[PDB]
RNA sequence: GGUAGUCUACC
RNA sequence: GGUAGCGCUACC
RNA sequence: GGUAGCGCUACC
């Protein structure tokens, strides 16, 4: 039974004409009800007319998959079979969706489905191409994520291949594309004309010409989704007395550690003067983010530079590692107070004490009691945060508080602080911390229930609770010195359906928030221009649509000419263990398989220790992995990668962070962060074949 | 960082 | 293990 | 616009 509202029916009109469209409506307006109605009309008209029908509904986050699948399925007759597909599944996708009418999927499942046929171990293993046009209608939930190299963008890439190459099979037609979103975003453009072009580009890439926007029933929409006021509350940042002394004394300690590096670089006769190429003087402002840019990029040079004396690499990597912890220590002092920041620093420094060098143990003893600095007052943001909690708890004993922070560790700290707060202890208010699941989901679900029952009344969370999760309506939303984009600004305040308040001690963070409100009104102005000058907008879409196919071909041509040139250079790279530098193999021995990079040198098995995973753990993991491999050399044991099952055979893949490249015939030490950087700059492994699988199955 | 445009000072 | 996006920042 | 670093989240 469908009791469709009036503004919802308005949002179905374009789609019900069979046209591609994007549905823009606030979060909580019932877009999945709109989709369910469109799927119903699509299924019934086409079934009665004898035409084929098959729906696909995609959403980026797999946690609201059963929720949105059950919702849509409930509005449809039982003759229509619905099926969820996701990474936790073990059966191939091709079979699961064979006789299903509604597929509910994460978009990568469809990317792999459509690209699965392009690679094979041999000609007999080849698969028939699964054409995206097998679906007659496709829904992009949160379609503002159709940008750059995203899964959604790669699904539209398949669409445009079919649209321009004319390879669709007999009877097929281009599917109807429907997008759902609360806001398409401004692309951080500065005026309406540019934002209109940006939106035209997004439409073009989805092959959309007509936006679906509530125009008549605007008042009915206001009632069903109110306007929440977003207040900003700037707080004082203390730099007086103990707090400034802790900062000043930790700054002097870092300058001494920076001297350990310089004394070492002098012995190598290396002259100091970007920080990933040249050795540079550290920035004077130690707590500025530009300092971490220096420490981290410099540490890449230390493992990518060939020294000449003994221990130079050891003392520098020891120094840079301490400076990282000092920078984070300064960062934790901004959000809290020197007690917490020193607690972190003491633990980190005590952990490394057994291994510290001579010079480093001397420096720490000279500052460990000095940095103490007795004790300082509570951070103004904490006290102001507590004040907001008490003000709501007096008005309502059923008070639900959720606090967004930036880092996982900051949630750990703020949680421990709020629980040890005397005024909250008496007032009967416990707090729990929550973070992202990707690196137990049941231990997290347990916290959401306790938060709903009222056992815990405060929830310190990272940005995980901004989308997807079913978090109960909260009385107060606090953004503890944290802000990001304008799309989350519309969906971070959208969780209040209640007051959201930004507590910050940074003007740059207040400005970032006010800019995101300007972007919100800039969207309104632009959407109005689009609605009221529809012909000009159509011309913008046509201009952008004219660019897509030649751009796709240019991109494909660039990839092929890049491989062509790499083959003409014909450079061989030695692949060594990053820790022990034992030669693991060469680039000629690497093969690729589902964007995994496998060693196909049979001698490689004798350089590693396999470590299998139990079938219990494998079922929980949402990708292909059977175990790990570790460097076999003595006193190394570095994890070099993982085992993946290829046609029943375990094969070893290499982690990019566990290896270093050497041009064959030189000592040139190339460091790499990701395999995609290797494919882009050095060599492109060819697809793994059946011969390679057998050769490694036997050698093992 | 590159380009286009404008301004200001100077031969 | 691989990949995607977002924020901030550094250098050109 | 390009080249990098950190943090966050997600996906296979
Ligand atoms: N017309 C309606 N009839 C019944 N329930 C509705 C209606 N519109 C919205 N809802 C309910 O509102 C809730 C949120 O809707 P949802 O589709 O998740 O919104 P969106 O996906 O646009 O954020 C759902 O539980 C849904 O059942
Ligand atoms: Zn090793």
XYZ file of C-alpha atoms (C1' of nucleotides) and ligand atoms in Angstrom:
763
model
C 0.000 0.000 0.000
C 1.338 3.373 -1.150
C 0.003 6.574 0.436
C 2.104 8.896 -1.685
C 2.298 12.528 -0.576
C 1.614 15.317 -3.067
C 5.131 16.743 -3.422
C 6.336 13.153 -3.850
C 3.970 12.580 -6.779
C 5.311 15.822 -8.252
C 8.840 14.394 -8.026
C 7.795 11.301 -10.023
C 6.447 13.103 -13.099
C 9.617 13.324 -15.202
C 10.651 9.765 -14.333
C 7.162 8.446 -15.109
C 7.601 9.860 -18.621
C 10.493 7.403 -18.987
C 13.019 10.239 -19.092
C 16.321 10.300 -17.251
C 16.281 12.696 -14.321
C 17.809 13.642 -10.989
C 15.458 13.873 -8.007
C 16.556 16.602 -5.588
C 14.793 16.587 -2.211
C 15.899 16.937 1.428
C 17.061 13.981 3.482
C 14.058 12.301 5.078
C 11.628 13.369 2.344
C 11.088 9.748 1.287
C 13.175 9.333 -1.858
C 13.021 5.539 -1.524
C 9.222 5.813 -1.520
C 9.499 7.894 -4.697
C 11.815 5.279 -6.198
C 9.507 2.453 -5.129
C 6.596 4.165 -6.880
C 8.653 4.635 -10.052
C 9.724 0.982 -9.984
C 6.081 -0.047 -9.525
C 4.866 1.895 -12.567
C 7.895 0.735 -14.556
C 7.298 -2.920 -13.661
C 3.536 -2.902 -14.250
C 3.316 -0.949 -17.514
C 6.124 -2.956 -19.121
C 4.868 -6.334 -17.907
C 1.383 -5.610 -19.267
C 2.906 -4.335 -22.534
C 5.086 -7.432 -22.969
C 8.390 -5.551 -22.650
C 11.330 -6.699 -20.556
C 11.935 -5.022 -17.208
C 14.674 -5.184 -14.586
C 15.459 -2.575 -11.947
C 18.749 -1.756 -10.230
C 18.906 0.336 -7.052
C 22.377 1.354 -5.875
C 23.591 3.155 -2.760
C 27.210 3.729 -1.696
C 26.904 2.462 1.893
C 26.103 -1.220 2.393
C 24.633 -0.730 5.884
C 21.379 0.843 4.633
C 21.029 -1.932 2.053
C 18.571 -4.231 3.832
C 16.735 -1.115 5.036
C 16.211 0.273 1.532
C 15.676 -3.172 -0.004
C 12.944 -4.088 2.482
C 11.376 -0.644 2.091
C 11.158 -0.821 -1.710
C 10.134 -4.484 -1.801
C 7.267 -3.896 0.633
C 5.573 -1.485 -1.794
C 5.755 -4.021 -4.650
C 3.689 -7.120 -5.341
C 5.158 -10.454 -4.284
C 5.479 -11.643 -7.891
C 8.468 -9.288 -8.197
C 11.555 -10.892 -6.656
C 14.063 -8.625 -4.905
C 17.690 -9.530 -4.240
C 20.532 -7.767 -2.445
C 24.102 -8.148 -3.715
C 27.159 -6.891 -1.833
C 30.760 -7.717 -1.023
C 29.912 -9.996 1.892
C 28.313 -12.368 -0.625
C 30.258 -15.473 -1.634
C 28.278 -16.631 -4.700
C 29.055 -14.874 -8.012
C 26.822 -11.940 -8.885
C 26.110 -13.237 -12.396
C 24.036 -16.113 -11.012
C 22.323 -14.396 -8.069
C 20.554 -11.856 -10.285
C 19.582 -14.285 -13.055
C 15.855 -14.451 -12.286
C 15.400 -11.385 -10.069
C 13.435 -8.259 -10.954
C 14.871 -5.753 -8.446
C 18.600 -5.754 -7.661
C 19.781 -3.731 -4.650
C 23.532 -3.370 -4.750
C 26.605 -1.404 -3.842
C 27.897 0.172 -7.074
C 31.221 -1.684 -7.134
C 29.353 -4.985 -7.507
C 28.014 -3.684 -10.832
C 31.362 -2.204 -11.894
C 32.967 -5.619 -11.479
C 29.988 -7.336 -13.103
C 30.277 -5.153 -16.216
C 34.094 -5.415 -16.401
C 34.336 -9.083 -15.362
C 34.450 -10.298 -18.970
C 37.438 -8.202 -20.053
C 40.064 -10.397 -18.336
C 40.478 -14.161 -18.159
C 43.084 -16.816 -17.465
C 42.565 -18.334 -20.930
C 40.079 -18.461 -23.795
C 38.111 -21.367 -22.299
C 37.600 -19.431 -19.044
C 36.112 -16.482 -20.942
C 32.731 -15.178 -19.816
C 29.920 -13.670 -21.843
C 29.759 -9.899 -21.501
C 27.147 -8.712 -19.008
C 25.659 -5.585 -20.576
C 24.553 -2.796 -18.262
C 21.468 -2.476 -20.477
C 20.254 -5.762 -18.972
C 18.635 -3.410 -16.464
C 15.915 -1.189 -17.912
C 16.002 1.358 -15.060
C 18.864 2.238 -12.710
C 18.741 4.311 -9.518
C 21.760 6.225 -8.193
C 21.044 6.886 -4.529
C 23.220 9.781 -3.326
C 24.041 10.475 -6.964
C 26.151 13.524 -6.069
C 28.915 10.900 -5.659
C 29.054 10.525 -9.463
C 32.362 12.371 -9.791
C 35.900 11.737 -11.035
C 36.910 8.033 -10.815
C 34.142 6.916 -8.446
C 32.178 3.666 -8.874
C 29.133 5.612 -10.066
C 31.319 7.405 -12.627
C 32.616 4.037 -13.851
C 29.060 2.732 -14.210
C 28.176 5.726 -16.381
C 31.372 5.042 -18.333
C 29.936 1.654 -19.299
C 26.703 3.428 -20.252
C 28.522 5.819 -22.570
C 30.445 2.945 -24.161
C 27.115 1.328 -25.067
C 25.630 4.658 -26.179
C 28.447 5.432 -28.637
C 29.757 2.054 -29.842
C 26.408 0.491 -30.768
C 27.335 -2.898 -29.293
C 24.193 -3.467 -27.214
C 22.700 -6.911 -27.930
C 19.470 -7.586 -29.780
C 16.421 -6.201 -28.003
C 18.334 -4.043 -25.537
C 18.066 -0.276 -25.131
C 19.869 2.283 -22.997
C 18.525 2.041 -19.427
C 16.611 4.837 -17.768
C 18.884 6.611 -15.270
C 17.410 8.117 -12.094
C 19.481 10.000 -9.531
C 18.488 10.755 -5.937
C 20.179 13.355 -3.753
C 19.588 16.159 -1.277
C 22.032 18.468 -3.089
C 24.303 18.182 -6.116
C 26.902 20.513 -4.593
C 28.521 23.634 -5.999
C 31.864 22.179 -7.040
C 33.258 25.038 -4.934
C 32.476 27.484 -7.734
C 31.883 31.121 -6.887
C 28.864 32.300 -8.919
C 25.595 30.977 -10.316
C 26.766 30.673 -13.924
C 29.692 28.449 -12.921
C 27.598 26.355 -10.526
C 25.091 25.878 -13.349
C 27.864 24.607 -15.632
C 29.057 22.284 -12.854
C 25.551 20.873 -12.437
C 25.237 20.567 -16.215
C 28.410 18.471 -16.195
C 27.059 16.113 -13.547
C 23.813 15.800 -15.509
C 25.774 15.243 -18.723
C 27.795 12.414 -17.197
C 24.534 10.787 -16.068
C 22.931 11.563 -19.458
C 20.254 13.673 -17.753
C 18.541 16.742 -19.194
C 15.648 17.378 -16.783
C 15.922 17.968 -13.047
C 13.022 16.933 -10.809
C 12.436 19.741 -8.300
C 9.493 20.470 -6.013
C 7.883 23.621 -7.422
C 4.192 23.645 -6.447
C 4.056 21.902 -3.053
C 6.835 23.911 -1.423
C 4.758 24.627 1.689
C 3.851 20.963 2.172
C 7.592 20.250 1.995
C 8.442 22.774 4.725
C 6.179 20.990 7.193
C 7.616 17.549 6.459
C 11.248 18.752 6.695
C 11.742 21.933 8.749
C 14.600 24.450 8.615
C 17.088 23.938 11.458
C 19.091 26.946 12.734
C 22.865 26.406 12.671
C 24.659 28.526 15.277
C 28.425 29.048 15.558
C 30.016 29.615 18.978
C 33.615 30.848 18.998
C 35.615 30.109 22.145
C 38.788 31.587 23.583
C 42.079 29.811 22.916
C 44.387 30.096 25.921
C 48.069 30.808 25.281
C 48.831 32.357 28.694
C 50.905 30.876 31.482
C 51.219 27.103 31.832
C 49.639 26.393 28.442
C 52.008 28.682 26.559
C 54.956 27.387 28.576
C 54.121 23.784 27.669
C 53.949 24.880 24.031
C 57.165 26.906 24.244
C 59.082 24.147 26.041
C 57.885 21.415 23.677
C 58.923 23.696 20.803
C 62.446 23.874 22.235
C 62.571 20.090 22.627
C 61.650 19.708 18.952
C 64.374 22.154 17.905
C 66.898 19.926 19.690
C 65.594 16.795 17.954
C 65.763 18.786 14.717
C 69.439 19.284 15.587
C 70.022 15.549 15.845
C 68.897 15.344 12.212
C 71.137 18.221 11.143
C 74.224 16.869 12.916
C 73.627 13.565 11.116
C 73.172 15.205 7.708
C 76.409 17.156 8.220
C 78.420 13.950 8.663
C 77.054 12.845 5.277
C 78.074 16.237 3.806
C 74.482 16.788 2.640
C 73.557 20.444 2.229
C 70.223 21.691 3.567
C 68.370 24.554 1.891
C 59.883 20.835 -1.840
C 60.241 18.547 1.191
C 59.756 15.292 -0.752
C 62.811 15.987 -2.954
C 65.224 18.300 -1.104
C 66.206 18.384 2.545
C 64.719 21.571 3.988
C 64.792 23.575 7.191
C 61.755 22.805 9.370
C 59.087 25.500 9.648
C 59.390 27.641 12.758
C 55.681 27.355 13.621
C 55.624 23.828 15.031
C 51.854 23.437 15.489
C 51.046 24.671 11.975
C 49.798 21.902 9.696
C 52.607 22.808 7.300
C 54.971 21.284 9.854
C 53.540 17.785 9.416
C 53.948 18.291 5.668
C 57.656 18.736 6.419
C 58.151 15.865 8.879
C 56.268 13.300 6.798
C 57.587 14.162 3.336
C 61.097 14.302 4.818
C 60.763 10.785 6.244
C 60.107 9.470 2.729
C 63.491 10.845 1.649
C 65.213 9.086 4.559
C 64.165 5.655 3.273
C 64.579 6.819 -0.340
C 68.103 8.226 0.061
C 71.312 6.185 0.032
C 73.438 7.200 3.019
C 77.161 6.475 3.459
C 78.024 6.236 7.178
C 76.718 3.867 9.866
C 73.506 4.676 11.707
C 72.592 7.893 9.898
C 69.321 6.379 8.671
C 68.589 5.023 12.157
C 69.059 8.288 14.062
C 67.067 10.349 11.542
C 64.089 7.982 11.341
C 64.194 7.951 15.148
C 64.151 11.758 15.246
C 61.438 12.245 12.619
C 59.251 9.690 14.402
C 59.522 11.622 17.671
C 58.720 14.914 15.930
C 55.540 13.357 14.526
C 54.457 12.469 18.066
C 55.366 15.982 19.221
C 53.269 17.534 16.446
C 50.310 15.343 17.398
C 50.989 16.291 21.025
C 50.716 19.975 20.117
C 47.556 19.149 18.156
C 45.990 17.493 21.213
C 46.847 20.555 23.317
C 44.767 22.783 21.024
C 41.623 20.699 21.522
C 42.231 19.855 25.199
C 44.945 20.879 27.674
C 48.627 20.092 28.299
C 47.793 17.335 30.805
C 46.051 15.192 28.187
C 48.606 16.101 25.520
C 51.518 15.160 27.792
C 49.784 11.942 28.864
C 49.788 10.920 25.202
C 53.392 12.041 24.731
C 54.672 10.270 27.854
C 53.069 6.977 26.807
C 54.483 7.279 23.285
C 57.947 8.221 24.566
C 58.015 5.477 27.211
C 57.059 2.845 24.625
C 60.154 3.632 22.540
C 62.539 4.065 25.482
C 64.011 0.516 25.312
C 65.049 1.168 21.694
C 66.000 4.866 21.818
C 69.565 5.855 20.958
C 72.012 7.555 23.319
C 71.285 11.143 22.287
C 67.512 10.656 22.393
C 67.329 9.164 25.897
C 69.283 12.166 27.198
C 66.874 14.700 25.688
C 63.725 13.079 27.082
C 64.919 12.992 30.695
C 65.776 16.703 30.452
C 62.188 17.568 29.448
C 59.898 14.911 30.964
C 59.596 16.748 34.292
C 60.029 20.193 32.715
C 57.127 19.794 30.277
C 54.908 18.799 33.237
C 54.218 22.443 34.042
C 52.092 21.620 37.100
C 48.501 21.946 35.884
C 46.363 24.290 33.813
C 42.652 25.066 33.659
C 39.987 23.171 31.737
C 39.769 23.894 28.022
C 37.127 26.570 27.290
C 35.522 24.332 24.649
C 35.085 21.485 27.145
C 33.477 23.700 29.787
C 31.284 25.299 27.118
C 30.346 21.827 25.856
C 29.445 20.654 29.367
C 27.366 23.816 29.799
C 25.294 22.941 26.729
C 24.724 19.426 28.086
C 23.536 20.614 31.503
C 21.268 23.228 29.915
C 19.480 20.512 27.925
C 19.371 17.958 30.754
C 17.532 20.368 33.061
C 14.918 21.073 30.383
C 14.589 17.374 29.499
C 15.687 14.263 31.367
C 15.372 12.453 28.006
C 18.402 14.226 26.549
C 20.301 12.696 23.619
C 23.659 14.338 22.886
C 25.979 13.524 19.978
C 29.367 15.206 19.502
C 31.206 15.084 16.173
C 35.013 15.177 16.294
C 37.701 14.957 13.609
C 39.969 12.044 14.585
C 39.360 8.643 16.138
C 41.856 9.291 18.938
C 40.159 12.614 19.704
C 36.911 10.723 20.299
C 38.828 8.445 22.678
C 40.088 11.480 24.600
C 36.873 13.515 24.672
C 34.951 10.433 25.824
C 37.334 9.774 28.722
C 37.120 13.459 29.646
C 33.321 13.667 29.636
C 32.956 10.484 31.701
C 35.460 11.700 34.316
C 33.623 15.052 34.508
C 32.426 15.585 38.080
C 29.304 17.517 37.084
C 28.270 14.781 34.642
C 29.005 11.982 37.123
C 26.649 13.518 39.687
C 24.080 14.489 37.039
C 23.949 10.865 35.852
C 25.300 11.184 32.307
C 27.554 8.578 30.683
C 29.325 8.950 27.343
C 30.510 6.491 24.698
C 32.745 6.899 21.651
C 31.989 5.609 18.153
C 34.084 5.538 14.981
C 34.157 3.988 11.531
C 33.936 0.248 10.997
C 36.507 0.086 8.191
C 40.150 -0.158 9.230
C 33.132 -5.414 15.729
C 29.877 -4.259 14.151
C 27.897 -5.973 16.920
C 29.811 -4.098 19.622
C 28.883 -0.896 17.777
C 25.210 -1.840 17.423
C 25.273 -2.409 21.186
C 26.221 1.241 21.698
C 23.393 2.499 19.475
C 20.836 0.615 21.577
C 22.309 1.831 24.872
C 22.145 5.313 23.347
C 18.477 4.735 22.482
C 17.473 3.210 25.826
C 19.022 6.122 27.716
C 21.784 4.170 29.461
C 24.376 6.358 27.706
C 23.251 9.903 26.906
C 26.340 11.296 25.124
C 27.841 9.952 21.889
C 31.280 11.163 20.778
C 31.509 10.197 17.107
C 33.640 10.753 14.024
C 32.037 11.428 10.629
C 30.583 7.902 10.420
C 27.275 9.047 11.952
C 26.860 11.714 9.242
C 25.407 9.308 6.654
C 23.871 5.855 6.556
C 23.604 4.897 10.213
C 20.173 4.846 11.862
C 21.030 7.078 14.821
C 18.069 8.038 17.047
C 16.879 11.632 16.980
C 19.191 13.658 19.214
C 18.345 16.639 21.397
C 21.656 18.400 20.693
C 24.287 18.115 17.955
C 27.717 19.518 18.853
C 30.487 19.874 16.262
C 33.598 19.972 18.457
C 36.049 21.992 16.362
C 35.277 20.130 13.140
C 33.909 20.984 9.691
C 34.267 19.749 6.114
C 32.355 20.233 2.849
C 29.084 21.964 1.957
C 27.343 18.688 1.053
C 27.907 17.334 4.564
C 26.926 20.754 5.927
C 23.501 20.079 4.401
C 23.513 16.502 5.755
C 25.341 17.121 9.052
C 22.677 19.652 10.043
C 20.106 17.380 8.376
C 20.443 14.847 11.195
C 18.535 17.301 13.392
C 14.846 16.779 12.652
C 16.835 20.281 17.883
C 19.881 22.546 17.511
C 23.286 21.963 15.917
C 26.120 24.164 17.190
C 29.770 24.467 16.146
C 32.057 24.893 19.166
C 35.454 26.075 17.949
C 38.488 28.116 18.974
C 39.586 28.765 15.374
C 38.579 31.663 13.137
C 39.650 29.682 10.067
C 37.150 27.014 11.146
C 34.401 29.592 11.684
C 35.087 31.064 8.241
C 34.982 27.572 6.723
C 31.502 27.140 8.209
C 30.197 30.500 6.979
C 31.551 29.776 3.492
C 29.557 26.528 3.494
C 26.398 28.499 4.296
C 27.115 30.831 1.372
C 27.398 27.756 -0.854
C 24.014 26.553 0.422
C 22.335 29.802 -0.641
C 24.366 29.808 -3.867
C 22.755 26.455 -4.695
C 19.287 27.922 -4.115
C 20.023 30.852 -6.425
C 21.383 28.494 -9.088
C 18.499 26.016 -8.913
C 16.158 28.982 -9.353
C 18.111 30.112 -12.421
C 17.892 26.567 -13.789
C 14.140 26.321 -13.244
C 13.368 29.795 -14.596
C 15.710 29.670 -17.630
C 15.259 26.019 -18.649
C 16.371 26.645 -22.238
C 19.739 28.123 -21.249
C 20.313 25.167 -18.916
C 19.528 22.687 -21.692
C 22.216 24.400 -23.775
C 24.688 23.947 -20.909
C 23.860 20.238 -20.694
C 24.263 19.869 -24.463
C 27.627 21.653 -24.305
C 28.860 19.273 -21.600
C 27.371 16.138 -23.172
C 29.309 16.965 -26.360
C 32.544 16.561 -24.358
C 32.032 13.157 -22.756
C 32.687 10.679 -25.563
C 35.873 12.337 -26.946
C 37.099 12.728 -23.357
C 36.545 9.026 -22.665
C 38.455 8.090 -25.820
C 41.243 10.554 -25.014
C 41.587 8.991 -21.561
C 41.698 5.480 -23.045
C 44.231 6.636 -25.650
C 46.447 8.129 -22.928
C 46.445 4.877 -20.947
C 47.429 2.858 -24.022
C 50.171 5.279 -25.087
C 51.492 5.218 -21.519
C 51.835 1.429 -21.612
C 53.296 1.723 -25.113
C 55.978 4.133 -23.893
C 56.788 2.092 -20.781
C 57.385 -0.880 -23.086
C 59.655 1.202 -25.326
C 61.736 2.291 -22.328
C 61.953 -1.389 -21.324
C 63.312 -0.641 -17.859
C 63.410 -3.490 -15.338
C 62.873 -2.722 -11.651
C 64.146 -4.829 -8.769
C 61.517 -5.249 -6.041
C 63.072 -5.440 -2.572
C 61.782 -5.733 0.973
C 61.510 -2.265 2.490
C 62.896 -3.391 5.863
C 65.684 -5.851 4.988
C 66.132 -4.957 1.282
C 66.260 -8.600 0.190
C 65.522 -8.815 -3.538
C 62.023 -10.298 -3.756
C 61.611 -10.310 -7.564
C 61.596 -8.064 -10.644
C 58.853 -6.119 -12.396
C 58.871 -8.733 -15.167
C 57.484 -11.253 -12.646
C 54.386 -9.250 -11.631
C 50.904 -10.031 -12.951
C 47.630 -8.226 -12.267
C 44.239 -9.676 -11.349
C 41.224 -7.630 -10.211
C 43.498 -4.683 -9.385
C 45.644 -7.002 -7.258
C 49.330 -7.404 -8.109
C 50.672 -10.939 -7.788
C 54.174 -12.398 -7.810
C 54.523 -15.105 -10.465
C 58.190 -15.998 -9.907
C 58.127 -19.594 -8.597
C 61.208 -18.911 -6.474
C 59.289 -16.306 -4.473
C 57.546 -18.915 -2.304
C 60.895 -19.700 -0.653
C 61.318 -16.083 0.530
C 58.093 -15.871 2.562
C 56.126 -17.487 5.372
C 52.475 -18.162 4.589
C 49.904 -17.567 7.331
C 46.420 -18.823 6.513
C 43.118 -17.403 7.732
C 40.346 -19.591 9.106
C 37.141 -19.977 7.113
C 35.474 -18.190 10.034
C 37.500 -15.027 9.406
C 37.234 -15.325 5.616
C 33.431 -15.134 5.707
C 33.591 -11.816 7.577
C 36.014 -10.243 5.083
C 34.288 -8.625 2.103
C 37.043 -9.258 -0.470
C 39.257 -12.136 -1.610
C 41.994 -13.001 0.896
C 43.097 -16.352 2.329
C 46.125 -15.367 4.409
C 49.271 -13.287 4.737
C 52.906 -13.534 3.668
C 55.904 -12.293 5.658
C 59.556 -11.775 4.786
C 61.426 -14.903 5.830
C 64.794 -13.251 6.515
C 65.984 -13.236 10.120
C 64.982 -10.248 12.279
C 62.767 -8.923 9.468
C 59.427 -10.732 9.341
C 57.903 -7.727 7.572
C 54.430 -8.381 6.178
C 54.963 -8.246 2.413
C 51.322 -8.765 1.423
C 48.455 -11.220 1.385
C 47.281 -14.444 -0.233
C 44.343 -14.383 -2.652
C 42.615 -17.446 -4.104
C 42.774 -17.523 -7.915
C 40.940 -20.549 -9.336
C 41.437 -22.503 -6.064
C 45.175 -21.640 -5.867
C 46.575 -19.283 -3.247
C 48.798 -16.650 -4.871
C 50.946 -13.954 -3.237
C 50.135 -10.271 -3.737
C 52.568 -7.508 -2.808
C 51.742 -4.510 -0.641
C 52.994 -1.247 -2.106
C 54.082 0.058 1.306
C 56.211 -3.048 1.981
C 58.496 -2.746 -1.069
C 61.037 -0.491 -2.776
C 62.009 -0.339 -6.451
C 65.544 -0.239 -7.855
C 66.259 0.445 -11.515
C 68.180 -2.589 -12.744
C 71.792 -1.472 -13.021
C 71.697 1.313 -10.427
C 71.175 1.988 -6.728
C 68.311 4.421 -7.432
C 65.832 3.771 -4.611
C 62.269 4.567 -5.716
C 59.644 4.727 -2.960
C 55.983 4.073 -3.717
C 52.746 4.758 -1.841
C 50.239 2.968 -4.100
C 50.287 0.501 -6.963
C 48.330 2.941 -9.131
C 51.330 5.275 -8.879
C 53.519 2.400 -10.108
C 51.271 1.750 -13.104
C 51.286 5.490 -13.807
C 55.043 6.100 -13.676
C 57.068 2.875 -13.959
C 55.540 -0.368 -15.263
C 52.128 -1.861 -15.986
C 51.856 -5.560 -15.071
C 50.074 -7.669 -17.659
C 47.060 -9.830 -16.847
C 47.743 -13.116 -15.069
C 47.237 -16.196 -17.247
C 46.541 -19.859 -16.554
C 50.215 -20.700 -17.089
C 51.156 -18.369 -14.228
C 48.599 -19.908 -11.858
C 49.860 -23.446 -12.474
C 53.505 -22.391 -12.171
C 52.900 -21.025 -8.665
C 50.575 -23.853 -7.624
C 53.381 -26.331 -8.316
C 56.304 -24.382 -6.852
C 54.416 -24.039 -3.548
C 52.618 26.940 -10.840
C 50.592 28.477 -16.469
C 47.493 31.642 -19.300
C 44.168 35.958 -20.250
C 42.588 40.839 -18.469
C 43.276 45.435 -15.734
C 45.791 48.756 -13.010
C 50.347 51.554 -11.106
C 55.444 53.285 -11.775
C 59.356 54.008 -15.101
C 62.616 54.624 -20.709
C 45.668 -6.308 0.399
C 43.412 -3.049 -3.363
C 40.480 1.052 -4.649
C 37.050 5.527 -4.222
C 35.596 10.165 -2.285
C 35.926 14.346 1.242
C 38.585 18.083 4.476
C 42.936 20.619 5.698
C 47.763 21.661 4.507
C 52.680 21.837 1.880
C 55.384 22.795 -2.920
C 55.320 24.270 -8.065
C 45.605 23.772 -12.841
C 49.457 20.298 -11.542
C 52.727 17.567 -7.660
C 52.696 15.918 -2.615
C 51.521 14.968 3.084
C 48.033 14.102 7.194
C 43.170 13.069 8.868
C 38.292 10.928 8.018
C 34.716 7.707 5.843
C 33.291 4.140 2.566
C 33.631 0.146 -1.023
C 35.532 -4.669 -3.202
N 4.540 9.083 1.927
C 5.092 8.324 2.899
N 4.398 7.324 3.489
C 4.932 6.559 4.458
N 6.188 6.729 4.910
C 6.998 7.694 4.407
C 6.482 8.567 3.347
N 7.473 9.422 3.033
C 8.539 9.128 3.823
N 8.253 8.094 4.629
C 9.153 7.503 5.626
O 10.203 8.417 5.996
C 11.403 7.700 6.318
C 12.610 8.272 5.598
O 12.401 8.160 4.194
P 13.631 7.916 3.183
O 13.083 7.313 1.914
O 14.760 7.248 3.928
O 14.080 9.438 2.906
P 15.378 9.780 2.022
O 15.775 8.447 1.429
O 14.871 10.785 1.019
O 16.369 10.329 3.027
C 11.176 6.232 5.921
O 11.050 5.415 7.073
C 9.866 6.237 5.122
O 9.102 5.073 5.344
Zn 62.539 -8.402 4.732
